[PDB]
Structure formats: structure tokens, C-alpha cells
Amino acid sequence: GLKAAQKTLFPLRSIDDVVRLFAAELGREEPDLVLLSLVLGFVEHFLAVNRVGLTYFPVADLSIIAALYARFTAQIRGAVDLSLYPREGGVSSRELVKKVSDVIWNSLSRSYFKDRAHIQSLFSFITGTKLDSSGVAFAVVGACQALGLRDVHLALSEDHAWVVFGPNGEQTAEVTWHGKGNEDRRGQTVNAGVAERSWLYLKGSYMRCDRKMEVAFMVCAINPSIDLHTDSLELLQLQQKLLWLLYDLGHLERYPMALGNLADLEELEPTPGRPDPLTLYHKGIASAKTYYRDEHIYPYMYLAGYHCRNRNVREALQAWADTATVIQDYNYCREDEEIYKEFFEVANDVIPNLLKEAASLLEAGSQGSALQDPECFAHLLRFYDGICKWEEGSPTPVLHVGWATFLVQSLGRFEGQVRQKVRIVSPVLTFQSEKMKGMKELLVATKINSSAIKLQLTAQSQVQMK
């Protein structure tokens, strides 16, 4: 190592002192990822993992943080001999990146629950020898920075992390595992995944972080959970203040998920004088459209979730339709299961429950109901259209009869006089999927033909013999 200037703010005695540290680091040529991660993990440990003795804020003394830092840098410098990996052109080699990844990996406890909370930071790595998947990638990036490898950066998709490095930052390397029971590809590029148009690699529209975005990632990674029922107010406040710092400095401009997480935080506890959650969700979407070819799914899911929680049925349906309009241009591949789960839950749990409540409120005389609005019926149909188009050309199917039952139920929540108002052109809607085009017929009958809908959604050839 730490430079004299990095040590002057210690000891950190409050949330605001932590913020000052982040501000100072973000004003340097290269914010110190190892320092920042250790500090966050320290404070998260004593605010969420073990609050015994807590009276206000766990004071971070320089002696403690410097000793942690020293343990990290000694482990990396000792295990990674740079002389073995000459740096042609001031850039790193694939062998070097693999070596660092191996060092982190080989350091981890043989057996532990990999999706436990509070195993994301370098504090967990040093004190517990435990990291979660994306924590391994971050730690490889922190280790490379500590070694002076200015070219190695964190790459992020909506469900995975890896690194970029090399000439022009153009190389990619896997450095961690993905999911559960997948075969790891550490050391390889991500080009096969990009080529197959999976959600996992976002068709190449994944995030290539700079150092400041790496800081935003560790701040997003703060986990305020104490247990299932309780969050640390202190950590929520810290994460929120740090996200605003990053926002003000321009460092969330290319980070849609961070803007969504900040909006979620503001919904819980708004900061006076700041943009509304809805504004922030829309900025997240704008970020995805501007920097990532509008190929991200979660910016629309964050917005829909807000509208959902506020029982704005119309706007939630619109946002979910827009989510499906993104997914339609992907191929559903092995390893995309997390997004399938999200779409399944929306279709088969969240929407049904929203519409059930809407039906009850309609019975009690509501006005302007989504169930009387043909634009809302159109959004529902557009959501299913994108899911069907997603399925087209995919190596694994998406729909099955489990989805058909909920589709029939959801359609039926709208009276025929409402459904009849949507014009399906080859409120107006154009279908992209062949499944929904063949369904058009069935979508306006007063009584929905349940069996025909099921046949059309699942492309089941036949009915019961006997």
C-alpha cells in the first residue's frame, strides 16, 4: 504494498469514512481492487456475518487491513512467478492468466456450499478460503492488478464472469466455473458460446469492465443479508451511498444491472433529491440500448418487477413483453437455465397471480383495469410470442404442456370483447413466432378452446387414442 496516500484515511470509523476511501481510490489512476474488496468484506463480515459486540460500525484499523492485504499479495506473488511469463508488448499471455486462475482455484477449500452468502470478497478468500463463482473471477482480476497486469479486466454477462486481456484487450479467458454440474472450460475463450447465440454470452454484447466498473461490481456484490428475514441497514446504506458515488462519477453509465440494483435500493429507501426508481430503471434500459445493442434481459425484468410490486399490471405486462422481445433473438442453450427459470416463473406464477387479483378487483368494480384494456392483452400476447420465437432454432425446446395450462388461464382472464379488439397484422400487434401466428384464430373466441391452444403451443401432434 500500500502506498502512503492510500493509508491516510484509516481508521475507517463509519459508513461515510468507507465512502471517502472509495472516493479517494476512484480519483487515482488505478483504484486498488484488493484494498477495496478487503475493506468491503471486512465491514460486511462484522455487519452481516457476526454482529457480536457491534455498537455502531466495525472500525477498520489500518493494521488489520494492511495485514490482510499483505496475506493476499504474498500468496499471489509467491505462487505466480512473472519471469516465467514474459510480457510481450505490455500485455499478458493466456498462460499467465491461466496460472493466476489456477492459483486462486487451488487455494479454495476442497468442499463448501458455493452459493452461500458473504463469500464474494477477498476477505472471504483470505479468512475462509471460500469464493463464489464470480468472486473467483474478481479475485483473478485483483490478483492480476496486484501483479501489474493492467490489461486483465473483468468481463460480465447477466449470469457469468470471465476475463479479457491481451492485445487491445481482445482475448477472452474462462477463469471460473458456471452453474452446478457443468464441465469447466477454464483457460478457454468464450467464442463457442458467443457463436451459438446463448444468453449466457449475450451474443458478444457482454460487459468489458474498466477498473472503475470493477469497483462498481464489488459494490453490487455487497450482500446486506443477515438472514432470510433481516438485512443490515448499515450495509444497505453503504451500498446505496457507494452506488450514488459511482453514478455521480459516471461509472454506472455502461452498467445496466448496477442501475437496476440502485433503483431497487431507492424503492426501499429513497434518497432525498435523487432520481425516482422509475427514472433509474429507464436509465438502465437506455444503457443497454446504447452500449449493448439492447441485448440484455434484466433491464426490462428490473422494471417489470417494480411495476409488479406496485400492482401496476399494465406497465408490468408491457415490460415483460419488452423482455420477451429481447430473448426472441437468442437460442436457448445448455447453461441458460437461469433465464428459463425467470421466464417460467413470470409466465406460470407471477402473471397468473397478478391477473387473479385483477379479476377480483374487476368484480369489485375497478375502472381502467388491465383486464379491460386490449393493449394489456396485446402485451400478454407479445410476451408469449417472444418466448415462442426464442424457442425457434434452439438446440433445446422451451415450451411444454405445463406452460399451456397457464396460457389458457391467463387468456381467459380477458373477456372476448376485450380480446377481439387487438388487431393481429401480418391496439395492433405483429407476431414473429410461427406458434403464435397459428394461434391467432383461437385468441378471440368467447370460450377459449383450451385443447386447441395446448396443441398449438406445444406442437403436440395427437390427442388421446381412447
| Cβ closest to ligand 5A0, residue 161 vs residue 439 | 161
Report in angstroms how near the CB of residue 113 gets to ligand 5A0 at its nearest.
Answer: 17
Report in angstroms how near the CB of residue 377 gets to ligand 5A0 at its nearest.
Answer: 24
Q: Which of residues 128-147 bind ligand 5A0 (CB under 6 A)?
A: 134
Cα 118 from Cα 116, distance rounded (Å):
7
Is the omega angle on the peptide bond into residue 11 within 30 degrees of 0, that is, cis?
yes
Place of cell 461490481: 217
Task: From 23, 1, 19, 21, select the one nearest 9 (Cα to Cα).
Answer: 21
| Cβ closest to ligand 5A0, residue 45 vs residue 307 | 307
Binding mask 91-130 for ligand 5A0 (x = CB under 6 A): ----------------------------------------
Name 9's Cβ contacts closer than 8 Å, sequence gap at least 6. 17, 20, 21, 24
Name 399's Cβ contacts closer than 8 Å, sequence gap at least 6. 387, 388, 391, 435, 457, 458
The correct pick among 166, 224, 305, 374 for binding ligand 5A0 (CB under 6 A) is 305
β-pair type (230-231, 225-227): antiparallel
Residue nearest to ligand 5A0 (CB): 134
| Cβ closest to ligand 5A0, residue 301 vs residue 457 | 301
β-pair type (423-424, 428-429): parallel
Task: From 282, 326, 6, select the one nearest 158 (Cα to Cα).
Answer: 326
Q: Judge contact between 266 and 277, C-beta under 8 A.
A: yes
The correct pick among 39, 258, 265, 317 for binding ligand 5A0 (CB under 6 A) is 258
Q: Is 303 in the site for ligand 5A0 (CB under 6 A)?
A: no
Q: Is 34 in the site for ligand 5A0 (CB under 6 A)?
A: no
Q: Is 242 in the site for ligand 5A0 (CB under 6 A)?
A: no
Q: Which of residues 148-177 bind ligand 5A0 (CB under 6 A)?
A: 156, 159-161
Binding mask 203-222 for ligand 5A0 (x = CB under 6 A): --------------x--x--
The correct pick among 247, 302, 343, 377 for binding ligand 5A0 (CB under 6 A) is 302
Report in angstroms how near the CB of residue 396 gets to ligand 5A0 at its nearest.
Answer: 21
Give the containing element (helix H, strand E) for 446: none
Q: Is 301 in the site for ligand 5A0 (CB under 6 A)?
A: yes
Report in angstroms how near the CB of residue 138 gets to ligand 5A0 at its nearest.
Answer: 8
CA angle 95, 148, 170 (to 5 degrees): 55
Report in angstroms how near the CB of residue 236 gets to ligand 5A0 at its nearest.
Answer: 15
| Cβ closest to ligand 5A0, residue 329 vs residue 342 | 342
Cα 430 from Cα 433, distance rounded (Å):
9
| Cβ closest to ligand 5A0, residue 142 vs residue 305 | 305
Helices (DSSP H) in 221-310: which residue ranges? 233-248, 256-268, 277-291, 298-309
CB atoms within 10 A of CB 104: 23
The correct pick among 261, 318, 410, 456 for binding ligand 5A0 (CB under 6 A) is 261
| Cβ closest to ligand 5A0, residue 99 vs residue 178 | 178
Q: Judge contact between 433 and 392, C-beta under 8 A.
A: yes
Report in angstroms how near the CB of residue 217 gets to ligand 5A0 at its nearest.
Answer: 6
Coil, helix or strand at residue 172: strand
Stretch that binds ligand 5A0, among 67-75, 107-115, 240-248, 255-263 (CB under 6 A): 255-263
What does residue 392 show for φ and ψ, rounded to 5 degrees?
-60, 125
- Please work out the total of residues on this chain that contact ligand 5A0, with binding judged by CB under 6 A: 14
End-to-end CA distance of the chain: 79
CB atoms within 10 A of CB 354: 21
Q: Judge contact between 393 and 197, C-beta under 8 A.
A: no
The correct pick among 140, 218, 246, 257 for binding ligand 5A0 (CB under 6 A) is 257
Q: Judge contact between 37 and 69, C-beta under 8 A.
A: no
Task: From 454, 321, 318, 332, select the one nearest 390 (Cα to Cα).
Answer: 332
Stretch that binds ligand 5A0, among 38-46, 193-201, 295-303, 431-439 (CB under 6 A): 295-303
Report in angstroms how near the CB of residue 301 gets to ligand 5A0 at its nearest.
Answer: 4
Report in angstroms how near the CB of residue 287 gets to ligand 5A0 at its nearest.
Answer: 12
> Interface residues with ligand 5A0 (CB under 6 A)?
134, 156, 159-161, 217, 220, 257-258, 261, 298, 301-302, 305
